[PDB]
């Protein structure tokens, strides 16, 4: 009865809004008014205001919907979003964010704003600067709602990812400060979104983000330690990846500044059980090709004797073997000779793994087999003078 | 669940950005060690650069298409804009110039059909001769 009726009305609305001639198409009529210099500015303002009510109205129905009628509103919604250009859409939508009192409508409205910029280019640089400032200002207001806080963070992540460098520096620095503060948010959703922004923000800023470095790496390492403890967290996998991607991003952008804390980076990689080994191995290939090998070899000895030797974890041991072998096949001859006392000291520890190893014979033999090949490879690429004392 | 889906989206997006090849988020211990060691060299051999290239082109084609929709749409309105100002005598200085170019454009084409002046000199001379005999009118 009334359900059948509303189905037909939204169909009737859908037909008119559908972009099936200058006169018939609503979209073309709007742009003409915009293109007219003689068209009254107040008339333009009416179009902006009328759209915001129209956009809010359709979102209200979709929020409060019935599968077929749900789908029809989206065809209506799709037609609505294309009525006016990105320039006026942002102008007519950003004020409505604060005006809207429903968390759902705000949640919906943030998503569409990001979609409008998914297909834009350099012409939107002035517009996105306005959008970023508004999103930055609303977040302290929207801290109460996790979903709204999460989405606004992620829309910023998309906009910083896309032509973020072209954005004015003040917004970029402001975003990094804001994301860093919310890394401490108790909600796992805010942490992962906060972590993602820092990666893109640090990627854009590069060395200029070094000022925030004490506020990024040390808390992230502490977060990982808490991540292991709360294994009941449903977002443990995403969070652990979220910490790993953070290090991977800055391993390419700030290798030199991370070498001091490289040991904690390796600790995260070694013991990130939830993350897939492919991700963990891939980030290792980033460390070798970006960070000085000599510092790496020094750290492998410390971490092995501390944790991996007593870890009794197959993945941690195996991935440690991946780091050690990769370094030797890439370390230079000059670097090779200099770091000899440390490697051999580590090498003796590797032979003595069998005494403390809790694994079965086959694993230890396989582990020893790898150790021998790497040890032979490293002793080659050396000279007699350095090796005779060590022997 | 929205937290779940949104959590996967943000992490998955950066995996592509930073690690193109790695998959996205959705037994004897000795065998496990061997697999990880094997997995390195084959991952080390992956052509991630091509994977980056394929994504870049796909994003470029759609973005290319959307502007081609953008400009193609606005000339339609621009020409529509020109029509009413001309009818209402609201032509701007720019409007009076684009139409003036069309006067030059359309006229310039018709000269080719109009033909060149020299041939008209021979053609006209032939024209009167054929006319006078047929029309006569000397009488």
């Amino acid at each position: 009865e009334f359900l059948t009726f509303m189905n037909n009305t939204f169909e009737f609305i859908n037909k008119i809004t559908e972009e099936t001639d200058v006169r018939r198409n609503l979209r073309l009529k709007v742009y003409s008014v915009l293109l007219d210099e003689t068209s009254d500015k107040k008339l333009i303002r009416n179009i902006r205001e009328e759209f915001g009510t129209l956009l809010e109205g359709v979102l209200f129905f979709i929020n409060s919907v019935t599968t077929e009628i749900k789908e029809i509103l989206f065809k209506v919604l799709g037609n609505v979003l294309q009525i006016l250009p990105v320039d006026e859409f942002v102008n007519a939508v950003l004020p409505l964010l604060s005006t809207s009192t429903n968390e759902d409508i705000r949640y919906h409205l943030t998503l569409v704003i990001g979609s409008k910029f998914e297909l834009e280019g350099s012409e939107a640089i002035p517009i996105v600067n306005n959008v970023m400032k508004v999103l930055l200002d609303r977040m302290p207001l929207e801290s109460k709602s996790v979903v709204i806080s999460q989405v606004i963070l992620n829309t910023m992540t998309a906009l910083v990812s896309k032509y973020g460098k072209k954005l004015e520096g003040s917004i970029l620095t402001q975003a990094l400060t804001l994301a860093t503060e919310k890394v401490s948010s108790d909600m796992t959703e805010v942490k992962i979104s906060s972590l993602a922004l820092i990666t893109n923000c640090v990627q854009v800023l590069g060395v200029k983000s070094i000022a925030f470095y004490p506020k990024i790496v040390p808390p992230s390492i502490k977060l990982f330690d808490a991540s292991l403890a709360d294994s009941s967290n449903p977002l443990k996998e995403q969070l652990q990846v979220a910490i790993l991607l953070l290090f991977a991003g800055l391993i390419k952008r700030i290798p030199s500044f991370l070498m001091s804390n490289i040991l904690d980076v390796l600790h995260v990689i070694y013991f990130s059980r939830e993350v897939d080994s492919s991700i963990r191995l891939s980030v290792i290939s980033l460390i070798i090709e970006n960070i000085d090998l000599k510092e790496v070899l020094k750290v492998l000895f410390r971490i092995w004797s501390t944790e991996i030797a007593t870890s009794n974890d197959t993945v941690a041991v195996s991935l440690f073997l991946s780091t050690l072998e990769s370094t030797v096949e890439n370390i230079d001859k000059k670097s090779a000779t200099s770091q000899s006392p440390i490697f051999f000291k580590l090498l003796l520890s590797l032979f003595e793994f069998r005494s403390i190893s809790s694994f079965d014979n086959n694993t230890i033999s396989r582990i020893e087999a790898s150790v021998h090949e790497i040890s032979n490879s490293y002793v080659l690429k050396m000279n007699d003078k350095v090796f005779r004392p060590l022997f | 669940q929205t937290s779940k889906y949104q959590a996967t989206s943000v992490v998955n997006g950066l995996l592509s950005n930073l690690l193109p090849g790695v998959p996205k988020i959705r037994g004897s211990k000795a065998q496990l060690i061997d697999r990880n060691l094997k997995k390195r060299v084959q991952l080390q051999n992956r052509d991630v650069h091509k994977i980056k290239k394929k994504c870049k082109l796909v994003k470029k084609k759609k973005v290319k298409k959307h502007k081609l929709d953008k400009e193609q749409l606005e000339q339609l309105a621009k020409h529509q804009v020109l029509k009413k100002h001309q009818h209402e005598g609201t032509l701007t200085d720019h409007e009076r110039k684009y139409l003036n170019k069309l006067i030059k454009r359309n006229s310039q084409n018709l000269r080719s059909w109009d033909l060149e002046e020299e041939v008209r000199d021979e053609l006209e001379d032939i024209q009167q001769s054929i006319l006078k005999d047929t029309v006569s009118t000397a009488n």
């Binding site: 749900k70 759902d104 998503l111 569409v112 979609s115 | 669940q1 889906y5 949104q6």
Partner: peptide, 24 residues
């Protein structure tokens, strides 16, 4: 003819996120 007949035969993401939120 039946043999011939056998031969003849032989020869939006915003929408989804919106809907997902409604389920919540």
């Amino acid at each position: 003819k039946k043999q011939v007949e056998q031969r003849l035969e032989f020869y939006l993401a915003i929408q989804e996120a919106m809907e997902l939120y409604n389920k919540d």
